[PDB]
Design a protein around this ligand. Structure first.
Ligand code: GK2
Ligand code: GK2
Ligand code: NA
Ligand code: NA
Lengths: 836, 836
């Protein structure tokens, strides 16, 4: 078997090749609104966010859903524009939400009035459509919400009880604004914008760093959905909000993007094993008169401290209100993230904030002892709680009961839907007796727990995946891996007598689906390895003999696929029975124009951390286009999902609990050795590895643990010390540093610098200089120990980049350097002559 | 001519070669004390700082100077130990003073009592020897100066008027302490140690960053040498001090050496074209009773503001008192550093600090209008003022006159000694009339200005070089370049009827000399290219017929040379007549074991900035040992002093005024082309360049301007934007940015990133990550523009290093990487095969 060597191009030639081979976000956030026009030809209008084309802002569009279609032809819904033609907190939110696009990122809608609310840059805007005032046939002018606030307004929400009122955050405090009267009012006085962040560490209505980065919670306040009528003809609007105190949280410095300043910005960063923010619940009570003017605002606090009413809770993972606004609900985690609670919180638990110790005691006594936190659900696990966005509360049927659907892996090790009924008993704890509550004084008895789904597959509840409940037919629509861990599909099931799960999406594609609130339509963004992404609308219907049974019918195209790219060869999905006892899936990019009797250099691209699956039946010709480019020059490219990756259940995910970095490369090498036994064109004497974040971390572990296998490792923004990473992520998978001294040591590449090769052209480190997620200190301290251990390294910095690469010139330089590095140190003939 | 290729060793082999080839500060700060022992065999005891041997702390030693010697034999003076067996402000001072050694860095001495004062780590210590109490024959126990101060005490000075009193700095305020009574007293209340540096930017008795880094001034307070007797039997001690306000000075962040913190330290850094600190003079008046107890301390300020009494002055370059303490003196610069003034300041210019506006006016009126600042000397230049340590005031002979020796380049363009007599006239400015002074109201008339030296050569007045004045014989001893710009020599001359300059040191060596206060002995640290450094004592004497004439005689050895190193071939000093009209000197390291008919790879080592001369007749086998190592592997090594380097006069130095970076590489290339025409073994198709600081700056300019000449450039801690460097240095050589837009642009490599090669393995950047002198931002912003211009680079960071390399593991890694980089990209056969 002859060694194939890649053509040795110059730096300028590789730049030109990359520019020539380089030469639009699909519609999303769908909403169905009924036309109610018996004589008219349309049943529904759909609204959605989309980019008008290749390079432009995201804006609001609408399309018309016809009552009937020509089933001979294919209907292309035309996009109608709904609308007429960054600060530091915007930049950081875009990092936390992983937003790459510009324009409207989300929108609020009040169905009763048809009021849209949305942020477009520095402005908060509103338009009206689909309400009682009817449906526009032309673009609407965005109405600017005027303000006296000097700084950026973030996170605007419409009051569901009254669409004249919005709330928003300004300098980490909650404000409200009436979009008819133009009354503007600050509700919380917790932060001072003039003060330094070392002095003022308090915020209201805001999700702090760990909850944006590690729990995908971006709001810290929630409108009560109903208003309380007053005897004066006015009403009371309520807002539940989280209040944070970050005083005890460590401050770290991250280089300012303005490099000319030679200054750093301060950041409240809870590193693993140190203090998370001090958190509590608060309620703002807004009294409004008959003509919509604010009478007074009463800020209210919990009758007893948060640490007493919610013993052992570190994180408020999720929160909201019950449908009729009777209770506030919250999903609460302990520090270990092995205990989840769903707790109902009555507004009667909140008393006015009072400094007068005489009046404060009068208010404490005015609240009954029967008013108590209600733990309606509590679960534990020896692996970890995976937080999700699934939680549905049915309308209150009986007085002292709550009926709800929740999802959990804790019973079977796979995420499944459960219908639960909890009894709201009076607690035997009485705070007037002047003691602390016993462990289970607020726990509710379970009247009923019914498994809706089950099996060796999971329901999805993150990244937009959720459920839709048909309360009439008593069905629940959900996304799952029931047919395959390589494809997401839409399913429907009864939650009354659960049994047969009907798949509503077509096999051979992975789907991401939105179901109409009216449960008679669904949209699917679908793709596979060979075909780029499409978006189609499907009408739902029941057979006349069985309303429980659901059928699908293609209705119209929303986005047409471009078709297979002219210059892209998709990879082949493969699999192998691992010695670990699991099927592990992989992707193989064969070198283009295979010559026989020749073995080729191999590049292993890796992530290998939790919360990600690289191998699945989706189109990889956009985000992983350059793996096809490597194959086009004569590199074998391999991707393998090792244990710890997602969509395979909690056991498979929990394989590296307490021992991150110790098991992943075994699977990666096992998959490489399986491939090389079946394929003789894989040269195992020229294997490179490359990844970003956890991928860069494992790229370093690969060269450290297995220099016998891996010639070169290119590690982007890698974790090198787990003590440097944050509480939410690190303690979930690795526990507290005191309870895992060996795991933290072995899992940290920087603590083992002397195990790297004493041989150059094998280790390349890449890092965004402004990275506030994986701090640059990970690289600088690894270099410190590499220099101290007399070890060679190559380094590239991206001075304008954080954790991701956003500036196209940085991306072009990264692709060019990496391609040139693989050529000179792995692929080319000169790379072979250099090895000593 | 065949190309010679260097042996291609592995990383591990080069590390071993460097370790095998790798396998003590000479005595300094000398002081002569007369024994006055007619019957005894010794005339003098000398005290000095030295390291006991190879690796140990610097401490105080003494040696005995015999009245007679055996002129047949060579006397080795034996070293007697005088003594019995870092904070952030210590680290930064060691950076500013370029101290590499540990232990006692300096010492104070009061001759009247024999009291030594010195700082050894966190302690201030005193011993007594050579006073009226006699001379020890054994080591003395250091007496700790006890304190209640919690933080490090810096810059301890003995009161010359009273050796019971010392002053020191603590948290940027002046304290005094009596080493007999143990009374301790804070004199200034200008700084709060508990406050953050953003809030409190004031200091007293301290030299700020630019004056430590760019003017070699490390103290900000000066004892008055005489005490004023009071009618009570007590006395008044005085301290002149500088008070600084850095409020308007820009704050920059430098990474903390504790990388685990991920924090940065704040630094007051006056970048070019921005505010220097607000400075003034202050006087502390300490009244002491008959038994040495403090009665009261009166802090005093100037009668009118500093900006009025010293119009146009930015920098207090130097300060002190006249011998009898009648006046304080100061050497003052304007911002452009083209105007120097020597100004006498009477204590009567200072009034008590008073808030009471009624009493303040009473004190202002109590001071006569005849009391005024006296400008005794003022000079200007169109190049720049070079500050030096030469300033001698003779004892006051007449009432309204001052007689002094100063040094200046402003008259002839070469630094020479001048004896000046100034008339202290009453100024016609009267402050009671309520106006501001006219430009020349404080200028004194020059009665007499006499050139003591002259010619195409300079007197030295920095880095320890100074004058010694024999007021009896009326001679002045000085160091100069009169015989050669490649050697420093000791000279003596009359300052009464100046004429013949007698050289007291032997040619064939460069000398650094200390003359006894008694002017009958001198010590020389001398070396040359072939012989490492020696230290010898020479007795001075006059012929019986002419006391003006001075002769030398070897007396004894202090430090014996080790002799020529066994594994070191010195370079050859060469020179060439430049097209610029100057002789330029160079150093050539021929490749070891020259083979004929073969051309070798060439490495040009460069500094090329102001204040440095690399080429001279000194031993280079210590600091530049690794240039010999490069020659031993087959590299031609070249060093050239381009225009702008020192020891050649102000015209030669002023060649790159306003155009730094534009002329240096022309000289370097001219010297290379001269060498290659005379020597055929120089391969001009394989030239590398390497330097640090200004050297790294010019290494980048070399690759940028002349990629036709230079294959590879390795730039350490380089200046890439002159706007990022400081006021004192940058504005001296380049002026204000507004007055030199093109010079700052062309002189900044980062503004011209698109002129670098689109060809890898040619540019290596090295930088200490903690560098507070040349900020790391120089490299990060250059990388930003290189990435944006699609240009390749190699990078090495030293995370534990500032501007210099102190940790030996960092130095070993730097030498190993550089040697390996030259092998792989310039010297070896593989380096030739790689070029596309
Ligand atoms: B990287 O994988 O993007 C980085 C290192 C570990 C986790 N992480 C993250 O950015 C995020 N905290 C998770 C949620 C992927
Ligand atoms: B480097 O040459 O050490 C650096 C860049 C320009 C001047 N400089 C200095 O460190 C110092 N400020 C001078 C005094 C050498
Ligand atoms: Na996130
Ligand atoms: Na200095």
């Amino acid at each position: 078997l002859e060694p194939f060597y890649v053509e040795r191009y110059s730096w300028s030639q590789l730049k030109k090749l990359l520019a020539d081979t380089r030469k639009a976000k699909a519609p999303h956030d769908f909403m169905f609104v009924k036309r109610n026009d018996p004589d008219g030809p349309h049943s529904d209008r759909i609204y959605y966010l989309a980019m008008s084309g290749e390079n432009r802002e995201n804006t609001l569009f609408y399309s018309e859903i016809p009552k009937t279609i020509n089933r001979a032809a294919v209907l292309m819904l035309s996009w109608k524009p709904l609308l007429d033609l960054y600060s530091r907190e915007e930049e950081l939110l875009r990092e936390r939400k992983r937003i790459g696009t510009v324009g409207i990122a989300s929108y609020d809608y009040h169905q009763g009035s048809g009021t849209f609310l949305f942020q477009a840059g520095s402005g908060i805007y509103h338009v009206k459509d689909g309400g009682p005032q009817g449906f526009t046939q032309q673009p609407l002018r965005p109405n600017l919400v005027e303000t006296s606030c000097p700084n950026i307004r973030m996170d605007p929400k419409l009051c569901p009880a009254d669409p004249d009122w919005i709330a928003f955050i300004h300098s980490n405090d909650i404000w409200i604004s009436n979009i008819v009267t133009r009354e503007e009012r600050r509700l919380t006085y917790v932060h001072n914008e003039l003060a330094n962040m070392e002095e003022d560490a308090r915020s209201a209505g805001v999700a702090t760093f760990v909850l944006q980065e590690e729990f995908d919670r971006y709001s810290g306040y929630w409108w009560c959905p109903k208003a309380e009528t007053t005897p004066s003809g006015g009403k009371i609007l309520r807002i539940l909000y989280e209040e944070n105190d970050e005083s005890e949280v460590e401050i770290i410095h991250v280089t300012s993007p303005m490099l000319e300043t030679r200054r750093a910005d301060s950041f409240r960063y809870p590193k693993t094993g140190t203090a998370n923010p001090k958190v509590t619940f608060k309620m703002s009570e807004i009294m409004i008169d008959a003509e919509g003017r604010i009478i007074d605002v009463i800020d209210k606090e919990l009758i007893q401290p948060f640490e007493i009413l919610f013993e052992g809770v570190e994180y408020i993972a999720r929160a909201g209100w019950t449908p009729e606004g009777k209770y506030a609900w919250s999903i609460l985690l302990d520090r270990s993230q092995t205990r989840l609670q769903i707790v109902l919180i009555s507004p009667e638990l909140f008393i006015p904030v009072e400094d007068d110790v005489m009046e404060r005691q009068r208010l404490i006594e005015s609240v009954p002892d029967s008013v108590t936190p209600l733990i309606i659900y509590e679960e534990t696990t020896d692996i970890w709680i995976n937080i999700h966005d699934i939680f549905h509360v049915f309308p209150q049927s009986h007085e002292e009961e709550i009926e709800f659907i929740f999802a959990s892996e804790c019973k079977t090790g796979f995420r499944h839907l459960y219908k639960i009924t909890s009894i709201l008993k009076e607690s035997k704890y009485k705070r007037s007796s002047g003691g602390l509550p016993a462990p289970s004084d607020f726990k509710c008895p379970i009247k009923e727990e019914i498994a809706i789904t089950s099996g060796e597959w999971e329901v999805l509840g993150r990244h937009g995946s959720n459920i839709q409940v048909d309360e009439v037919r008593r069905l629940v629509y959900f996304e799952g891996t029931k047919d395959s861990p390589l494809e997401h599909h839409l399913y429907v099931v009864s939650y009354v007598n659960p049994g047969e799960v009907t798949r509503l999406t077509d096999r051979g594609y992975s789907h991401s689906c939105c179901i109409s609130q009216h449960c008679d339509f669904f949209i699917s963004k679908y793709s596979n390895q060979k075909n780029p992404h499409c978006v189609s609308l499907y009408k739902l219907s029941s057979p006349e003999d069985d309303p429980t049974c659901k059928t699908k019918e293609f209705w119209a195209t929303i986005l047409d696929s471009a078709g297979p790219l002219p210059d892209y060869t998709p990879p082949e999905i493969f699999s192998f029975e691992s010695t670990t006892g699991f099927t592990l899936y992989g992707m193989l990019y064969k070198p283009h124009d295979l010559q026989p009797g020749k073995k080729y250099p191999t590049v292993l691209f890796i992530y290998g951390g939790p919360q990600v699956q690289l191998v699945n039946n989706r189109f990889k010709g956009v985000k992983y286009f350059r793996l096809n480019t490597l194959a086009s020059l004569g590199y074998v490219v391999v991707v393998i999902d090792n244990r710890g990756s997602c969509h395979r259940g909690l056991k498979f995910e929990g394989a590296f609990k307490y021992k991150m970095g110790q098991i992943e490369i075994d699977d990666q090498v096992e998959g490489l050795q399986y491939l090389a036994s079946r394929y003789d064109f894989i040269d195992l004497d020229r294997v490179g590895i490359h990844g970003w974040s956890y991928g860069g971390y494992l790229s370093l572990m690969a060269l450290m643990q297995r220099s016998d296998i891996f010639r070169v490792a290119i590690a982007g923004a890698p974790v090198t010390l787990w003590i440097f990473y944050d509480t939410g992520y690190t303690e979930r998978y690795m526990g507290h540093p005191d309870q895992n001294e060996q795991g933290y040591y072995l899992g940290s590449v920087a603590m083992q610098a002397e195990k790297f090769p004493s041989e150059p052209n094998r280790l390349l480190l890449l890092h965004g200089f402004l990275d506030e997620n994986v701090h640059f200190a990970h690289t600088s301290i690894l270099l410190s120990f590499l220099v101290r251990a007399g070890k060679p390294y190559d380094l590239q910095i991206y001075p304008q980049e954080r954790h991701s690469i956003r500036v196209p010139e940085s991306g072009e330089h990264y692709e060019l350097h990496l391609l040139h590095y693989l050529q000179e140190n792995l692929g080319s003939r000169i790379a072979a002559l250099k090895v000593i």
